[PDB]
């Protein structure tokens, strides 16, 4: 996210959010993706918030 822009990770960008979920539908640990801690926290909050609005699934099963 430090490459060009994006002052934060928004909950409306599903294309970026889907890069940080596993096929099950869980958040990917920061030690794998190499993301900074601050940006990982922003990922977590955005993913939960978008998961509320049914844009992302809580679980692959449902």
């Amino acid at each position: 996210f430090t490459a060009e822009g994006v002052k934060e990770i928004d909950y409306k960008d599903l294309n970026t959010l889907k890069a940080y979920v596993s096929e099950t539908g869980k958040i990917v640990p920061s030690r794998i993706t190499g993301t900074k801690a601050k940006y990982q926290r922003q990922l977590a909050t955005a993913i939960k918030r978008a998961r509320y609005l049914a844009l992302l699934p809580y679980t692959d099963s449902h």
Partner: protein, 106 residues
Amino acid sequence: MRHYEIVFLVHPDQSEQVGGMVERYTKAIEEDGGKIHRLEDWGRRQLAYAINNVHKAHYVLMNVECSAKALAELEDNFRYNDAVIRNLVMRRDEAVTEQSEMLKAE
């Protein structure tokens, strides 16, 4: 006043008069000194899970500049309306006004 961002999705059966609800809400909140900055409609998407045993909903976004009174009355409208399903209000500090995701795909 104070900035707010509201995401609001309507039952698919009533997903034809959504213009009316948008207009009445906008009037009711800008008649008290409020303001509308962005009003986006990307409705009729598929749900990632079934809410009230439906799998479709009509999404809409609006950024508003309102006060406590307008907030409370709009929240009541969403609360006691039956074509509301789900709601999200996300106060922020800047007026965002230039597209969010629209339909990037063809």
